Amino acid sequence: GAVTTSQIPASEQETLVRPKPLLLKLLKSVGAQKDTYTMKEVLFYLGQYIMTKRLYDEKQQHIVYCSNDLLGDLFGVPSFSVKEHRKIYTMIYRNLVVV
């Protein structure tokens, strides 16, 4: 229940975080049962959320469109590239408290 990337330092992906209410709701909707997570766990559950909500059907194009989903409100963008991992981390950090 974790996903990692070479674009971000490994240790950063172990950062302990407490999601604020919207982020926490999204994670719990796909089976998360806690209040505190590592970042790589947050990325896993958010990935599961994205696929469950059908926000990434075009696998070849690497754009996620989320303008009309809770995810769009969470991140503050209509769309983002799944390949820009630092940008994704930045957007997630705004929605949690770092322990």
Ligand X SMILES: CC(C)(C)S(=O)(=O)C[C@H](C1CC1)N1C(=O)[C@@](C)(Cc2ccc(C(=O)O)cn2)O[C@H](c2cccc(Cl)c2)[C@H]1c1ccc(Cl)cc1
Comparing every residue's Cβ against ligand X, the nearest one is 47
In this structure, what is the dihedral angle of CA atoms 87, 93, 57, 68, given to the nearest 10 degrees?
-110
Instruction: For residues 4 and 88, give the distance between their C-alpha atoms in angstroms, rounded to a whole number.
Output: 12
Q: Which is nearer to ligand X, 46 or 96 (CB)?
A: 46
Chain center to CA of 53: 13
Q: Is the dihedral of CA 47, 44, 1, 10 positive or negative?
A: positive
Shortest distance (Å) from residue 7 CB to ligand X: 7
Shortest distance (Å) from residue 99 CB to ligand X: 19
Shortest distance (Å) from residue 5 CB to ligand X: 4
**Interacting residues toward ligand X by CB under 6 A:** 3-5, 43, 46-47, 50-51, 56, 62, 64, 82-83, 85, 88-89
